[PDB]
Amino acid sequence: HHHHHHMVHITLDRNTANSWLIISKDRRQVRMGDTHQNVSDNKERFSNYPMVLGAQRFSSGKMYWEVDVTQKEAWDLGVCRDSVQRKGQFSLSPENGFWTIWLWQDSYEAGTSPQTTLHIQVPPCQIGIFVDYEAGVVSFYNITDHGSLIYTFSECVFAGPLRPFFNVGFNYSGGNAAPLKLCPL
Ligand SMILES: COC1CN(S(=O)(=O)N2CCCC2)C1
């Protein structure tokens, strides 16, 4: 692709994080902690899942960023409305305000309703995410495979400001402790 020039510097918003997440000092990395991380509760925190938002809000334009997923077994990545549900159980779908892909149990899927199988020959170590607000597009790229397209959501109905969205996944297996990292420009 040729979207690299729309690169934006994303940082994570501590206040939105599930209470078990550990965000690095530079706000560029997140991982699952062993326990509650000793923060107060608030209405912004995702309660049921190991999720966190970027601080940046987008309402126009073209935006691109990259995320490192090296050695993880499970994660969700994409964008979401600023007003997504934070508490209780919910599915990742455009109806609920999410435009995401994920890895789970050795397969990749797009967060449509129902979910869509992805065809990836080279397991990615870094994912590129492109948002065109005006066009209603969210696209995902395999940086490990020379930028090959993974998935395009088109005809998106954002219906609000967008925020970068992250889920580090649970670590029941002991194989999913590695962080998500925002990669440098
Ligand atoms: C980073 O590794 C730690 C192992 N655990 S956990 O994922 O099994 N789990 C999630 C909530 C209860 C314990 C996090």
Report whether residue 32 contacts ligand 1, using a CB cutoff of 6 Å: yes
Experiment used for this model: X-ray
Report whether residue 35 contacts ligand 1, using a CB cutoff of 6 Å: no
Report whether residue 170 contacts ligand 1, using a CB cutoff of 6 Å: yes
Give the whole-angstrom CA distance, residue 108 versus residue 183.
Answer: 21
* Distance in Å, CA 152 to ligand 1 centroid: 32
Q: Where are the domains of the chain?
A: 4-182
Q: Relative to the CA of 32, which ligand 1 atom is closest?
A: 1
Three-class DSSP labels, the chain: CCCHHHECCCCECHHHCCCCEEECCCCCEEEECCCCCCCCCCCCCCCCCCEEEECCCECCCEEEEEEECCCCCCEEEEEEECCCCCCCCCCCCHHHCEEEEEEECCEEEECCCCCEECCCCCCCCEEEEEEECCCCEEEEEECCCCCEEEEEECCCCCCCCEEEEEECCCCCCCCCCCCEEECCC
How many C-beta atoms surround the C-beta of residue 180 within 10 A?
A: 25
CA atoms within 13 A on the CB side of 142: 17
* Distance in Å, CA 134 to ligand 1 centroid: 40
Beta strands 21-23; 137-142: pairing state: unpaired
Give the whole-angstrom CA distance, residue 86 versus residue 98.
Answer: 12
CA distances from 105 to 60, 75, 83, 109, 144 (A): 35, 10, 29, 11, 20
Angle at 138 between CA 132 and CA 140, to 5 degrees: 125
* Distance in Å, CA 176 to ligand 1 centroid: 9
| Nearest CA residue ID for atom 11, ligand 1 | 170
Report whether residue 172 contacts ligand 1, using a CB cutoff of 6 Å: yes
CATH topology classification for 4-182 = Jelly Rolls (2.60.120)
- Resolution for the entry shown, Å: 1.3
CA 10 from chain centre, in angstroms, equals 11
Q: Are 163 and 54 in contact (CB under 8 A)?
A: yes
